[PDB]
Assembly symmetry: C5
């Protein structure tokens, strides 16, 4: 048998196959199973609020026509340039940006057809998809990003979309993300869409992402704690009558606030307060208090000098006050810092532990 005669007899002009009519017309809705393969997950960002993904869409449906049963083989791998003479279903994504097809040398398309009429359609597409992430806890967080597949032009009475029981979502081997860790859970549920025109089918897929804490610690947690260390026992040791001691303190306050301004650069503008903001505010409070304490001891020493110019006994009293304040501080401040850090770290670890459940 010649191949040409079968290919034009099956789906051509001599056949009564109209490509504008759905299979099982005036009948039960056409069921469609959808299988997705993830080739390369990438380009997650915060300011734009979207990520990039390159998928391999695969959808199967049945046709009562296109049942040959004359060749002795089971399936046929047809050419992909005659995909315009069959009934492809419509499918779009609600959060759709970009989405251009890949057509290098030959169109990246695939067609298969079985003896009973089961078809197999495979398309390669790169999707820019919008994820509305919530940055309540900025350094430690889990983000859920949504993919939606739905029918633009048909109602529920036609083209019901179903998931696949086995291997619904697959990932390419050895795929890694520099910033996030993907979780192997991939919970699947479907939510219908209601409009004034009608009610339309939809299916949804969810991915869970965990941010890596490694980078953030080195850029922000360690240098801020260094600036704090540079104030803990660097000027308290120094002599009370020093211009430089106040200079040291002012410069430390200045550069740490400049770092605090530096931290909020990539982040999109939001009303609510992030965890990193809390940490920077507390560190700024300690370094500002350092100058405060200096002002206090300088004012007490000024009274001592003013009366100095019974007086010796009062002079002794005033210097003794100075010594008590400085030593008391030199041991008072470390513990409050310690109590803070332990409280902050334990509360953030337990809130992620509760949220993940």
């Amino acid at each position: 048998m010649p191949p040409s005669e079968f290919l034009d007899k099956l789906m051509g002009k001599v056949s009564g196959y109209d490509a504008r009519i759905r299979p099982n017309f005036k009948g039960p809705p056409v069921n469609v199973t959808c299988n997705i393969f993830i080739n390369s997950f990438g380009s997650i960002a915060e300011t734009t609020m979207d990520y990039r993904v390159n998928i391999f869409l695969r959808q199967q449906w049945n046709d009562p026509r296109l049942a040959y049963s004359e060749y002795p083989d089971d399936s046929l791998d047809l050419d992909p340039s005659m995909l315009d003479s069959i009934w492809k279903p419509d499918l779009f994504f609600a959060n759709e940006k970009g989405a251009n097809f890949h057509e290098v040398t030959t169109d990246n398309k695939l067609l298969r057809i079985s003896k009973n009429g089961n078809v197999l359609y495979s398309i390669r597409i790169t999707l820019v998809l919008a994820c509305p992430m919530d940055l309540k806890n900025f350094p430690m967080d889990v983000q859920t990003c949504i993919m939606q597949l739905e029918s633009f032009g048909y109602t529920m009475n036609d083209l019901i979309f179903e998931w696949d029981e086995k291997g619904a979502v697959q990932v390419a081997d050895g795929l890694t993300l520099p910033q996030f860790i993907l979780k192997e859970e991939k919970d699947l549920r479907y939510c219908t869409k209601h409009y004034n025109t009608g009610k339309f089918t939809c299916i949804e897929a969810r991915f869970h992402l965990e941010r890596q804490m490694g980078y953030y610690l080195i850029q922000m947690y360690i240098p801020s704690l260094l600036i704090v260390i540079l104030s803990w026992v660097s000027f308290w040791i120094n002599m009370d009558a020093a211009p430089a001691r106040v200079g040291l303190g002012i410069t430390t306050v200045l550069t740490m606030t400049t770092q605090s301004s530096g931290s909020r650069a990539s982040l999109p503008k939001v009303s609510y307060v992030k965890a990193i903001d809390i940490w920077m505010a507390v560190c700024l409070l300690f370094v500002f208090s350092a100058l405060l304490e200096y002002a206090a001891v300088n004012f007490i020493a000024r009274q001592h000098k003013e009366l100095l110019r019974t007086v010796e006994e009062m002079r002794k009293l005033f210097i003794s006050r100075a010594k008590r304040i400085d030593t008391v501080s030199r041991v008072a401040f470390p513990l409050v810092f310690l109590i803070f850090n332990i409280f902050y770290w334990i509360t953030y670890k337990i809130i992620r532990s509760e949220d993940i459940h």
Copy 2:
């Protein structure tokens, strides 16, 4: 009855349907009702002066032709690939940038046809639209952004555009903006367009936006007020003969002006003065006055030392002057700041309250 015979008999070559002629030719103008659904409002910006929106346009009109009345059903959901054989009306937006169609797998289009001849056309399009915002009050403001739909090629005698009485503008459930809050008012009015060629129909839709005050306070209001706090009682306490006191003051003036330069980065260049500029200018005036007062007390002390090298009585007079000036300042400055902030905040709250009405 076969479907193919009806579809080509109705709108094909055997039918006298010319797709280049308007319905009701040499007759009353074709009325068109327009319904819009907002899928995703996003990407509002100031420098470029425009925003991004993804809509679901829907327009209905009547045709005296395309009245079948032979099938027993009421409406028909046709294929969307034969939308080139009917009379679509022309429609464009005056503030048009971008506006490319979404064609993933299948064109996102919809066609319906009733027994009398009422059609239903639905198109998905992403629009970049120019909004000429007025930044008279930068942190607290309400912005009105305009959408215009008008006919490029037909005059008033044809294609009059009407709004829909019920559900003219709809919004997707759970839609939020990070920076702005959308108001559920959506006032609709239509303004005709006059040209030398002729007079053309148009309809307009208005959206009201409220900016969130939360982010701006933390980035700018609180640190500037911190710098001010760092000058209020940090160097006044310190001893009069100090090089560091003037160093402290100079550095505070320097970094606050650098912050003032930093604030105007995203903003487009404008001639008029914003509210945030007023606040930064007043804060700069206070910190500059701090140095002023230092220069004054230093000059008085220099006269005291110069004569010091009746003289004691004049020496006492000069130091007494020094003490009066410093203490007087230490209580004089807080109130003026307080009177300022209360005046500024109450006037901006009442101007927004008057403007919103």
Copy 3:
């Protein structure tokens, strides 16, 4: 009469109308009048050297064919999808970047035809056009930007382009630019183009733009004058034996030069010197002179101390010298600044006044 018969009889296959031949072949050149409407002027920039404009091109010409005279009406508004079966003239812009057409829902096109044969063609196009601006005077300047319309493929013997006597250039009502003020002059002249292939017709339109002085004053003129004020009477008052006085002066010199570097950011690199550069250089000269004068008084005081360790009479002489220098400076410097500013401002106002004529 049916519409279909007239539309295909007039400009179809039964008609001997070849769309590849110009009207009045082997005859006098086809005259063309061009009318332009400006919808939205925007995006003027300096670094890229170009601006963006959205126009409504309109061109009219006569045809000896396409003269019907059988319907009783005067003109006909035809469909815009059959603009490929007539003789459109070629037209391009010499400074052409971008220039893509707007095709939302339906192509933005317009066709009209009169009884004698006068046609009317209207096209909406967004143009990126290159303007070679001269920044000899940067804050105060007038810029002339050029639009050129010319024929690529025909010589002078065909397609002569003419302007329209009345309403040649129109602007949309209530159109404003944030940075520039447009002038209602719009002088029109035409310059022919000569090439080795032949001589080709062209027409030119000129727009005059005035930059707003409001923004530039607040960002640059006022803070630099503030830094200068911060040196005029802040350290001269202070005691001669002060480390801080020189610190004050050095910091002021440093930050003003950093501001001078900051000013030249948007500007494209150019060999010649702008006015703003002159102002910044003069301010830098004053603040550098401030330190100079300090070095002088410190050296004189050092000689006084060195001999101090007849001597009293010489000691008195040296301190008297110190006082003369400082007081003389305290009144000498203001006038030279005043003479400068009055000279600079009057010369720039009179040069713009002479240039505008």
Copy 4:
């Protein structure tokens, strides 16, 4: 013989050549040899994780049809506009971004055909290809970048891809990269792909790149070592009772940490620690220790002054302690730096030497 008759008789409508059927149908798989020529390697970057390449793909296969043997010549150079009437194989790249064809004036295509049936297909294409580089050692590293060629729609039973034994990968003469040095090794191996649909052929090509150390030394290694030099013997020489000495040290710590923040700008965010981070951390440790030592000597001197206000013998003891500490440091610090640099440089040279093997 006329050329037209041969060209349409060979591959036209009178010929039974169907372009939708593979050669040797129901037969052994079609073998394909692939030869690549690299025109211009460029645009390697780290943040985006991809590079740009412009290649000349060349693939040869045999056909049992298209064997003429009637003209007396061996090969024919056909027109490249009739490449749609033959059986091109499908080919795509797994890491595919961009990949648009070059079509200036005429499509950049090439066709040749021999007497036996061997064809020659040449295509010019610019590829954006993703390379997942590992930055374990940032300044000194070797990066391997992967190119993959595979069949989208055919299984192993058809279209097996083979490399070419001679001249598989060629490079244009005099091709250089500003940042990297290409290695003339180009190891070639092939890895098959397994999917649920089937098993598909693939071939892989690897390129080795060496980063140049010249630029990194001048921007980062030399200035940091300068800051370190500016602390080694600049303040140790200075008098113990100096405010400036601590000022010097604080400023050096501040600017070096600002440089450390500056270094990580181009780099993508990663959890693991790079070599440059180790070097900057160690330098920061030395400059922080400098202030530490100052605090120590100041505290010892304060005890000396406090008791100073047997006492002389204890006063001598305390100053002697001061001298021992300072001189000991002045010779103690250089060696540890020397031991460090020699250890760091030798370990990085030997790890690259081991890795390259």
Copy 5:
């Protein structure tokens, strides 16, 4: 005679003109002369390594067919929409980026045909072309940029490309570049290309560019020399026992190195050292030496004070040493700077003078 009959009789279906066969088939190669007109040279940059140019390509060749000799005129200006029915030659550029055609209203194309068969083809195209510039001497340099035209699909036996003897390269009148000066030399030579497939013709055009020295002097040469001036006689005059003198020097070193980092921003990363780097390194060496000298005099003064607490004679010796060192320096440093600048400037002027030849 009707025009339609001649246009379809000459190059249509009744004519035996096959557009897929080269003229003079099985004959001597088709000679082609190429003339280029430069409309607008622009956008030269360093980081990307490429420039932008808008040209008017013009190529002439002869055909033995298309010789009419029946109309009485010499040449014909045909329509440019029938350029698909003739034998255009293939032509591409080796360093090809972008290269999209300009199609505003009508395609920018031109066709002419003479009586003997000489055709004239004109195309407007904007080219992004890669220039591999060598930055050995960054502020003063001459750059040569290459344009290559070559045949993709034909060997030497066909389509030999020749230049035009008169007016090969033309430039539009009044064309200027902001940064570079174009030289009116334009040397033309041709280099053949050898490949494994065959040997292919090519022709090359070279442009010489001179960078303007005006901008670079004001941004970098003058302020660095200012910082140097701010160290020459500002602190040497000041008293030896001053904390501020060392503060002055440290700040000058700091800001100049920050400027040195600032200078290398636009520049692409390169291993070799530019001239500007040499100048900045030498200036940094002088300002670092300034602090060095301070450390020296402070150490000598410390010995003087230590012994001070025969001794007077040694005290005199030590102060005399101090005076000798300072005065000697005050006259020693200017000359070495002078010798440097004269050496550097004369060597760079003579190397450009030798290179240009």
